Design a protein around this ligand. Sequence first.
Ligand SMILES: [Cl-]
Ligand code: NA
Length: 129
Amino acid sequence: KVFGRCELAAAMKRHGLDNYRGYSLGNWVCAAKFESNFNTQATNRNTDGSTDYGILQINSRWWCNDGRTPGSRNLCNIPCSALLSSDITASVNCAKKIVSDGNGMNAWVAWRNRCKGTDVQAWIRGCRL
Ligand SMILES: [Cl-]
Ligand code: NA
């Protein structure tokens, strides 16, 4: 599914991401544009050989098991495939655990490289609040 911008803003608020560990809702919406272009089915290869999955692009080396990444820890006890669904619960439960891993949202290179230091409110401007 390719979520509409305000549709995704609405969903992440439902699960309690607005201001989670101090990161305003718009930082998450901003992360989800640039990681995946708003698409729950997104999958990408990293060099280290790991793959990034879904809306936020959760990585298989630590975070979910995909069976092809040596040394995977499956720190969300989850199949990476389940994070491509249309129901973003698993991707949020896991994202809550990553962000809480100390380096915050800097765990997302597109957040660092593109969201951070910006007016992350443009990402929810027009959302019915
Ligand atoms: Cl932080
Ligand atoms: Na893993």
